[PDB]
What does this fold into?
Amino acid sequence: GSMKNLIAEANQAVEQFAGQVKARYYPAYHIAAKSGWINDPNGLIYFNNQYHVFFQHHPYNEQWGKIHWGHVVSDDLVHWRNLPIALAPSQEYDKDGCFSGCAIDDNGVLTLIYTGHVVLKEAGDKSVFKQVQCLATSKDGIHFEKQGVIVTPPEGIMHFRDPKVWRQDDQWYMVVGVNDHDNTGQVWLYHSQDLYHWQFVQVLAKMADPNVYMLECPDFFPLGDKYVLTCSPQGMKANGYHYRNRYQSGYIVGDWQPGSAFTITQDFTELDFGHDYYAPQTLISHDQRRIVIAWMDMWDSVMPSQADKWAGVLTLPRTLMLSSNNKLLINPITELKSLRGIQKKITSINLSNAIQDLQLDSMQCELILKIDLTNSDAERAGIALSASPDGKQSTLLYVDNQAQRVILDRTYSGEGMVGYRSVALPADKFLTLHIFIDHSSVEVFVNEGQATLTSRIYPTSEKRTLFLFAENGALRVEQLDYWQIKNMRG
Amino acid sequence: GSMKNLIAEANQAVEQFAGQVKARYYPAYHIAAKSGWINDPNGLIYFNNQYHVFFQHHPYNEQWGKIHWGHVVSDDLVHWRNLPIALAPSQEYDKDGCFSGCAIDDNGVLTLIYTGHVVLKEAGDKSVFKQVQCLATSKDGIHFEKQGVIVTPPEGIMHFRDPKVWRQDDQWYMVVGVNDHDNTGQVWLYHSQDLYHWQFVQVLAKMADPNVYMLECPDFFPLGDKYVLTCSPQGMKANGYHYRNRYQSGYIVGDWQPGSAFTITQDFTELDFGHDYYAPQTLISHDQRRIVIAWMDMWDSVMPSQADKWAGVLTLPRTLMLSSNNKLLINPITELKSLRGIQKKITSINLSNAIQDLQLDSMQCELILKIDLTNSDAERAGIALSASPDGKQSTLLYVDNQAQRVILDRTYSGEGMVGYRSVALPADKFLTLHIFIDHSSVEVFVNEGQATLTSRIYPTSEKRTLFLFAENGALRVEQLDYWQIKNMRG
It folds into this structure.
């Protein structure tokens, strides 16, 4: 009945099914539970010389259900260690889930502020529920004590969730996402002197598209001379190359100071153009980088790992910097280089109407592929990742010279979902693809961080290699760097 | 030595290898030689109650070589009958080929005006040759008599070819394509009172792109209140979705009258957005339609039919009409309906994340597929043409809702070339695809004739079916009409 006993029960279920988890799709250097289901990352913080990541977690099976907070820690944002579960549903205010939230340092006390979820009437997607903001503390970083409800919404407001709290002007601010009376998604800003008593300040942001019914997972933070709002809109219609995923994740750049509206200088932009990127949260690193982690997955997608008694992976952590035109340059954190093994460097690889097996293991590896766009005039030219030795199965990452786009096509990748995602080719003589392959994922960083593509893949081949290919013309690879990537856990 | 004996020898070679031609790729209702190689259509004319089409023809094997004029006839632009060869190289002025040309009615005498080609020095692509315009006559429509050279170029002009001649103001005009002293492609206009003595009138057209070194196969004709120039530029760089084929075919719309420049109102536009469309020529039908036929092929493409001792197919004949914004609406001639057999009508077919075998023979058939674009929101949704029963092999014709384009992808079609061609989705609630499938070809007419896609395919399956497919969303087919198409020859 006590949360201490509910956490012990939950930890025992995770430990029980951990032995049934197959390696084929389990990430070597991304965050996953030992077994069972995870989704959105929560409570990101650098606290007492360590990086903490929590996540939405169903401990009892590989599907979504009674949500707990899972927990990992690292010294270096890379060597993530599994910890015991932090929060289990245990009170009227959180009976049906400890939903998303953040962490803060309250005068040396690690403090979690999360949405408590309770179902009031079960009608599937027509369900009525109660969402309020709740607070928990820890003296040791491992065991947490609930301190109860701290923010209740207005009457008629139901969707009211995903608090992100920060200190400013010896005061605290909170952003939450809300579905308003007129059925529009908004981010609301609240403030507090004590973390227990909160007052509404303003509607921080809404979107012009009236079909956006929710803004999940708001994070509002300074970056250079601007403020950035990252969030996850629901209800944006897929439009050409835009908003292809079931739900969106992206960013708004503007100007704000306490007492002012958030005046938008750059409208909503997707954070990642791939298939599997949802529910970003950020933290400030020790050296004051702005770091984003997201769920490397998408609601309603086929999840082949569920056959193996686990599901859910987080993205690599990525740095956020403003370009001079106030777009986010997004790059892998430098600490990932610590996982690098055997380096292989190939220079000046030409192909014309041909394929080439590079004979490089594609289970867990990092590539830097520099392509000469002027002289790579093939209709389709690039790399086949995580490929069967017969080349029948692969994840295609290539220049389409007709579309003038980079294509990530998982149609022939293995189990689960088909089709492609894409970005516009950058205005540059050279295209650099910085590619991280794990057992069930591809992350691509384009050029200096101008764009990223993140997709899950589920290869079925016993051995995984890489091919280069050029169809109907030439590929010019100026340089290919390859590293094997070590398991982060040892 | 005599052309009469050279034609007999050439006809005997065609007859000799005709028995070795396999059905698998041989067109049931498009023009081909009985055996051997054909390319550009020549001498299109309605003469003495019959439609004549000639074509560049190598009778002795399935590769390009000593060029003859092949010849077919029809009463109805559809039931084409093979005739004996019309012209064989036989003189100093045409020793290495009777290259392209036209036909006119010279006061009841069917008259051919063609380029005579002779190699002066063999250096591959560095070869020096002589091209002059020559004339031949016929009293019977079958046997032709050479009357010698009628137009010689200026000194230093080598590429000088593909005459198209028409009567206007009791005078004759000729257009030829030329490579000028500065290495630019031009169309030159000449005139004559007698068909034997020609005078240069003007440079009719040149293109702004200085890399265009040749304009092959010019045809200059009135359409409504405009003049249209169809031609085949060489040297246009492939640019995004534009100019993908090795060489181009397209049209220029403007204003002209004798004594004036051809003032361009619509710049060069491709005639067909597919893989296999080159060297159009036009004729006036009995009822005064403007009809275009082209070579349904492309220089330098893999030609799998060459294993079967023949190569080369002409397109369907198509009508040309000016839209109110002076683009060509291009439609199949109505006489093709005479080939229709068993009709099958399906209404209101929905698919979501699924495939459906329509169990319809795709050897030789006509389809009208009407798609609801508003409700066909799948990432990829359409038809798999000429498909193996296991669906491993097919020609994909579909809506890409990310690109917002119609895609014709022959990557999995069978033997030979891979990759796709495309057109922009029309601004219309509905997309109509009017599709003609023959043993080695697909022709698509979009909506009212706004765009066409023509590609060769080489299926290897013993049985050929059709599938509908929708990936990552819905397909709404409002109506599918199917006809089996009869062999035109009986």
Observations:
- The interface with chain B takes residues 238, 240-241, 244, 377, 379-380, 401-404, 417-420, 422, 471-472 of chain A (CB under 8 Å).
- The CA atoms of residues 62 and 309 of chain A lie 5 Å apart.
